[PDB]
Design a protein around this ligand. Sequence first.
Ligand SMILES: O=C(Nc1ccccc1Cl)N1CCN(C(=O)c2ccco2)CC1
Length: 121
Amino acid sequence: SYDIQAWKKQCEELLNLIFQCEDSEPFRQPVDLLEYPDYRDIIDTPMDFATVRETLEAGNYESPMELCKDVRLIFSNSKAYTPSKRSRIYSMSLRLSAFFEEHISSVLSDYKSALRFHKRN
Ligand SMILES: O=C(Nc1ccccc1Cl)N1CCN(C(=O)c2ccco2)CC1
């Protein structure tokens, strides 16, 4: 497809699949700073899947690359906060990241292809 707008619905669908994954539980909503009092000493930019979905539905992503940068920030924040590479919540993050990367690959390729076709002449 050379549809320049198709990525948006494709990302809505993929966020729906991520919300059905039990591995997304810890990442749907912001970290609570009463249960994790040192979070903002470690993490400069919090991110979660509900913020990603709201930013998409507001029309505040210009490309699936921007959405991808914010989802990758969810996963790098988990890696930066984990006291161990064997922790439950970090382990959930690695499986969810693999799922996300497997599915976003074609969304990015199709978008970049569609832009190149738009500028073909
Ligand atoms: O509290 C968290 N998420 C959450 C938010 C609202 C309701 C319910 C939940 Cl589980 N989080 C814990 C901190 N964290 C980590 O990535 C991490 C890595 C090693 C330990 O925690 C991010 C998710």
